[PDB]
C-alpha cells in the first residue's frame, strides 16, 4: 500500500543506533504487539478497497459528464 519496498536488515541487538531504536530495551509482550498491528490493519484494508471503488466511480462520471453535454447539443 505504502509503495515502500521490503525492508530486512536483521537485527535483535540493542548495541547499535538502529538496534536501540527499532527494537526496545523493554521486554517483549507478544500479545501487546499483535494487537497494535491488527486494529490499524483492519481500518487500512477497508480503506484501500474504498479508495479504489470511489476512484473508479469518479473517473467514469468525470469522463461522461462532458459526453452527455455534447450529445444534448448535437
Amino acid at each position: 500500500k505504502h509503495d515502500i519496498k521490503l525492508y530486512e536488515g536483521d537485527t535483535d541487538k540493542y548495541l547499535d543506533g538502529s538496534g536501540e531504536l527499532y527494537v526496545p530495551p523493554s521486554g517483549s509482550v507478544i500479545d501487546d504487539y499483535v494487537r497494535n498491528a491488527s486494529y490499524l490493519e483492519e481500518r487500512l484494508i477497508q480503506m484501500e478497497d474504498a479508495t479504489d471503488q470511489i476512484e473508479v466511480q469518479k473517473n467514469d462520471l468525470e469522463q461522461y459528464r462532458f459526453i452527455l453535454q455534447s450529445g444534448d447539443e448535437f
Partner: protein, 159 residues
Amino acid sequence: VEKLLKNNNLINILQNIEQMDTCYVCIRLLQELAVIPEYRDVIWLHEKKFMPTLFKILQRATDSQLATRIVATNSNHLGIQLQYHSLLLIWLLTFNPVFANELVQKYLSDFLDLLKLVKITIKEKVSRLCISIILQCCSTRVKQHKKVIKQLLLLGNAL
C-alpha cells in the same frame, strides 16, 4: 477481628506502602483471617479503608517497568508476594455472591486494572488470581451479572 479493624493505628501502618515491611505484614494478617468464612463478612465492613491502598500496590506494579529491577516491587520475590497478597485478600471477600456485585459497582475504575496485571506479568500467581476475581463477578450466581458483564466488556476492553 472487627475491633482491631476499626482502630486507627493498625490501619495507619497498612495504609503506608513506601515501607515494604509494614504493608507486607498487615495485608497478610487480614488475609489469613479471611480464609475462614465468618471473618469475610466483618472484614468487608471496614473495606473502604484498606481497599484503595490494596489497589494502589497493584496499579503501582503495572506502571513500573519489569525490564528493570528495582528492589521495591519488580519481578523479584518481594514484589511478587505483595501483589499476590493484595489479590488474594480481594478474591476471598468476592466468593460471597452479594459482595461481588457490590465490589464491581463501587470499585469499578480500580477493578478494570486487573486485565493489565495479567498482561505485564509472566507470574502465574499474580495472573491466575486477576482472571479468577473477574470470573467470580461474571458468574451466574452473582446478582445483576448481565450489567457487570456489559460494563467489563465495553469499557475495560475485556473481550
